[PDB]
Short mmCIF file of all heavy atoms in Angstrom, two decimals:
data_model
loop_
_atom_site.label_atom_id
_atom_site.label_comp_id
_atom_site.label_asym_id
_atom_site.label_seq_id
_atom_site.Cartn_x
_atom_site.Cartn_y
_atom_site.Cartn_z
N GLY Q 61 11.14 -111.76 -66.09
CA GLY Q 61 10.47 -110.49 -66.34
C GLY Q 61 9.01 -110.66 -66.71
O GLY Q 61 8.15 -109.90 -66.25
N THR Q 65 5.73 -109.17 -64.68
CA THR Q 65 4.67 -108.38 -65.30
C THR Q 65 3.30 -109.04 -65.12
O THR Q 65 2.31 -108.37 -64.84
CB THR Q 65 4.97 -108.15 -66.78
OG1 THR Q 65 6.06 -107.23 -66.90
CG2 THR Q 65 3.76 -107.57 -67.49
N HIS Q 172 7.58 -99.22 -74.76
CA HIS Q 172 8.23 -99.16 -73.45
C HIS Q 172 9.05 -100.42 -73.18
O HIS Q 172 10.18 -100.33 -72.70
CB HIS Q 172 7.20 -98.95 -72.33
CG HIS Q 172 7.82 -98.87 -70.96
ND1 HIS Q 172 8.07 -97.67 -70.34
CD2 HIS Q 172 8.24 -99.83 -70.11
CE1 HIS Q 172 8.62 -97.89 -69.16
NE2 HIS Q 172 8.73 -99.20 -68.99
N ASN Q 173 8.49 -101.59 -73.48
CA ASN Q 173 9.08 -102.82 -72.96
C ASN Q 173 10.07 -103.51 -73.90
O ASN Q 173 10.67 -104.51 -73.49
CB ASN Q 173 7.98 -103.82 -72.58
CG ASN Q 173 7.57 -103.69 -71.12
OD1 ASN Q 173 7.98 -102.75 -70.44
ND2 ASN Q 173 6.81 -104.65 -70.63
N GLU Q 176 13.84 -103.11 -72.41
CA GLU Q 176 14.12 -103.84 -71.18
C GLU Q 176 14.60 -105.26 -71.47
O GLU Q 176 15.63 -105.71 -70.94
CB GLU Q 176 12.87 -103.87 -70.30
CG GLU Q 176 12.38 -102.49 -69.89
CD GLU Q 176 11.09 -102.55 -69.11
OE1 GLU Q 176 10.46 -103.63 -69.05
OE2 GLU Q 176 10.70 -101.51 -68.54
N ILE Q 199 14.94 -104.96 -63.33
CA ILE Q 199 13.91 -104.92 -64.37
C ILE Q 199 12.61 -105.54 -63.86
O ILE Q 199 11.52 -104.98 -64.07
CB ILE Q 199 14.41 -105.61 -65.65
CG1 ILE Q 199 15.50 -104.77 -66.31
CG2 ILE Q 199 13.26 -105.83 -66.62
CD1 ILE Q 199 15.05 -103.38 -66.67
N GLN Q 202 10.86 -103.28 -61.28
CA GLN Q 202 10.19 -102.09 -61.80
C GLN Q 202 9.05 -102.46 -62.74
O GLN Q 202 8.16 -101.63 -62.96
CB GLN Q 202 11.17 -101.15 -62.50
CG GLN Q 202 11.72 -101.55 -63.87
CD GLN Q 202 10.83 -101.03 -65.01
OE1 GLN Q 202 10.17 -100.00 -64.87
NE2 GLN Q 202 10.84 -101.71 -66.15
N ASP Q 203 9.04 -103.67 -63.30
CA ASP Q 203 7.93 -104.09 -64.15
C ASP Q 203 6.73 -104.60 -63.38
O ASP Q 203 5.66 -104.75 -63.97
CB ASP Q 203 8.36 -105.17 -65.16
CG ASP Q 203 8.84 -104.57 -66.47
OD1 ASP Q 203 8.39 -103.46 -66.81
OD2 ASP Q 203 9.63 -105.22 -67.19
N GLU Q 206 4.63 -101.27 -63.09
CA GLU Q 206 4.27 -100.85 -64.44
C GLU Q 206 3.17 -101.75 -65.00
O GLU Q 206 2.23 -101.26 -65.64
CB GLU Q 206 5.50 -100.86 -65.35
CG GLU Q 206 6.46 -99.72 -65.08
CD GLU Q 206 7.63 -99.70 -66.04
OE1 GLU Q 206 7.94 -100.75 -66.64
OE2 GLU Q 206 8.26 -98.63 -66.19
N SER Q 231 2.06 -108.35 -73.05
CA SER Q 231 3.26 -107.52 -73.12
C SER Q 231 4.41 -108.15 -72.34
O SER Q 231 5.58 -108.15 -72.78
CB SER Q 231 2.95 -106.12 -72.61
OG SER Q 231 1.86 -105.57 -73.32
N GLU Q 235 8.37 -109.33 -73.70
CA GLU Q 235 9.73 -109.07 -73.19
C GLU Q 235 10.79 -110.11 -73.58
O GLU Q 235 11.91 -109.70 -73.96
CB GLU Q 235 9.70 -108.92 -71.66
CG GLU Q 235 9.35 -107.54 -71.15
CD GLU Q 235 10.01 -107.25 -69.82
OE1 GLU Q 235 10.77 -108.11 -69.33
OE2 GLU Q 235 9.77 -106.16 -69.25
CD1 CD E 407 8.30 -104.43 -68.90
#
Side-chain angles (χ1 to χ4, degrees):
Chain Q
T65 289
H172 181 98
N173 268 9
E176 300 176 349
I199 290 301
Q202 73 90 29
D203 270 333
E206 287 183 339
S231 305
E235 275 210 3

